[PDB]
Ligand binder design. Sequence first.
Ligand code: FES
Ligand SMILES: [Mg+2]
Ligand SMILES: [Mg+2]
Ligand SMILES: [Zn+2]
Lengths: 50, 38, 37, 157, 177, 278, 65
Amino acid sequence: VKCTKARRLKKRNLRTLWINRITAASQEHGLKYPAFIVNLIKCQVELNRK
Amino acid sequence: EGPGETVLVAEEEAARVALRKLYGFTENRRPWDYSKPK
Amino acid sequence: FKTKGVIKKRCKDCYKVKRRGRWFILCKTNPKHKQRQ
Amino acid sequence: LREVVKITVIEGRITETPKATPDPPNPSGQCPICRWNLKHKYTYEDVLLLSQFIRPYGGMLPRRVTGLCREEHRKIEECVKMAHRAGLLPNHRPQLPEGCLPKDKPKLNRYLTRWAPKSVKPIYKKGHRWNKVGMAVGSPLLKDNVCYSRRPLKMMH
Amino acid sequence: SSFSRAPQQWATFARMWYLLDGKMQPPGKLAVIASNKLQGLNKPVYHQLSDCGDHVVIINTRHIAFSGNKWEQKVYSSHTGYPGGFRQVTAAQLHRKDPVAIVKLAIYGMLPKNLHRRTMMQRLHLFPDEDIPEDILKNLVEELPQPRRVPKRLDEYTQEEIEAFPRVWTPPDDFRM
Amino acid sequence: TQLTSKLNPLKDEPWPLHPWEPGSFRVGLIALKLGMMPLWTKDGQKHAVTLLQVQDCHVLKYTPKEDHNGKIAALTVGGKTVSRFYKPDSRLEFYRDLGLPPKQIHKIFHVTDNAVIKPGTPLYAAHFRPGQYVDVTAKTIGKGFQGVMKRWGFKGQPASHGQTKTHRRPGAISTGDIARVWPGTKMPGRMGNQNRTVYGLKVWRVNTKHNIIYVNGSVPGHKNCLVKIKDSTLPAYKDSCKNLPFPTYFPDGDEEELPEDLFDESVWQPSEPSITFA
Amino acid sequence: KPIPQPDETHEQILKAKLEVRKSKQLEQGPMIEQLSKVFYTTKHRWYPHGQYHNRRKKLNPPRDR
RNA sequence: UUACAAAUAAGCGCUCUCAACUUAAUUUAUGAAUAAAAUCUAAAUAAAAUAUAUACGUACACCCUCUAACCUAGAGAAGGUUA
Ligand code: FES
Ligand SMILES: [Mg+2]
Ligand SMILES: [Mg+2]
Ligand SMILES: [Zn+2]
């Protein structure tokens, strides 16, 4: 049962891992996470968090 | 440039990087063309 | 220094003060009128 | 400025006083603060602004002489207290009557202090998350000041 | 990069020393910055299983500042584990007795509540004043901006700067002031 | 031969002898508890007094302020020479360097920098004088595992009227609701053999020949038990060391020849006329 | 910065930090405490494990490059 | 004093017992806002004034020879003594 309830929790944790690392990455260059993602989309460039 | 645990190891490794450069074995080199039909 | 919900002046000479975070009425003529909130 | 010189003969002599800067940005401003378009743009850290209304020993000047409207006579007074408690006016310390020395205890750095440190009791029972008791930061009188944040400033921390 | 594998692994996961100055800085803002570096959240290679934390050195902890009346209203509690051993001490008293405790507690509070917190806390180094040991100074690799801008005192302001600020009002010549 | 080599401190490159100033704390001796005997004062009252013998009391090691981890410096004072055949090699090596026979016990005395004494300096009962209040600390007599009644003076339960198998047992451990026992609860366990101190014990007499100090009242430990005599720390006795020898007394110096027995003014010496309450 | 040549393998550095001066090989409690200071870790990390946990470990874990 | 009609253990016998950095109800002083010959001040300041406690000081600190035997150390183990 845990193995079945964890197949749909590695797809949400692996995303939270990405947001941690993207927040870390942008902060080096001086941008908060919201600014980095929103502006990239507003330029019509679509790159996922992975 | 080279990273190392100690200055001597960093100095020795830094030489390794340069020798590749001269010989063009940097990993970012153009990939070998195994796909040429000829 | 009776502690009461409402502080009311008991004489004309009575005056109001705000000491150590509470309201006090002290009367020079009569120490009886001294009160605290 | 009239000041008394003692010799007994004591004489008060009027001396020239610094003149206010002419041409305020806002003409006909009823209150001196508004005259200069600083109605809702000053805070406790604005020592230069506040210093213009304070006695040499740190006391507040009377409203009449200053000319400030009551609305800005209380806000200015409140900000001055915060500045003194934060050690932003080191040259306006109290007058020592008989050369008495300071308490000699080290001064804890504080800012945005609403109340006197002596008159504030500790909150031993903090309260739970829903009922948590709040610690005052800043003063309500500065509610109308311009805010450059997404959401209003949190007065109670 | 063309670096060898082992040096590359050593370089990527190396640990850094960061100096933070606490003069006229609230402990919480110091705690926010310090805690982030200790866990390694500032690294794009951060992983909960990688033990990639970095050393943080904080100085001038005695000179921290609190907003409002937090000095006299914030209370720290401890229990010795014996009847009647409950002690509630205000921040001012704790700071007087131990200058370094207040900063340490904030970083401990924010860190994750797991076994790794204790390992991270070893990396934290707190000094009451600017004095630092010789070995630590060599270790330091970078410094971090203070989170809170320190307001300038009236005495600090230059005479010309005072002139720049206009005189709002002038007292009449017939005034004691 | 080793003991004789150290018999002359002042003629063996002694450290500077700084003068006394307020706030100074001296070193203290380690003595063997011979026993007790009665003593009388010129008021006629009898005071039970105990005999403490100083035996081969030599300062061993001198730590500095900073390394000691205290504000004050610290000296080690060993006493009661013992055999060499049943000691660990490490202890023998340390004593060989010091050039003294091994001592049964080590203890640490907090001593100000002014009162520091060079290591290896012999100490004698002349370090104290009659009159000075002194404090003694030593391990208490070990009584073994004991019940709650004897250890903590619990009242216990009655013997008759139906008390079935409950006479010396503890009562209710704690409160029921907490579902646990508070730490530090008084429970049956081993009693005695714990380091304890007695404060404010006057020094009635000092026997120079046999290095015996007469200390008022009871001192912890069994007879022949080593103790740690030290200048009293009570507020009233804060500055009683000024009159006494500041670093210590060096007989080898021979500044003055002291009598065999030193008495206090109130003490009634033997061979004196019988006390008359005129 | 110019490289400082006047004073080296990491093994030698460890020996200097973990100098054996007193008691030859220190006891685990003292020895582990000394190690914990050098690496800024706790003692609990260095303590061993039993034979149940040791045998659970994989002999040849997978490798990616 | 009472036992062991043992060298001991008890009390009914005997001795020793201490400091307060940091406060609260409260009381003073200087002093503005509040044009005073005011105001203890959730104004800037200086002090005094319960109980608490740990700033402060005692206590411990010594790192292992142990066939064995003895012990005022002890349930075992530990611990002490052995020219
Ligand atoms: S600032 Fe304009 S009315 Fe006062
Ligand atoms: Mg009974
Ligand atoms: Mg029965
Ligand atoms: Zn009245």
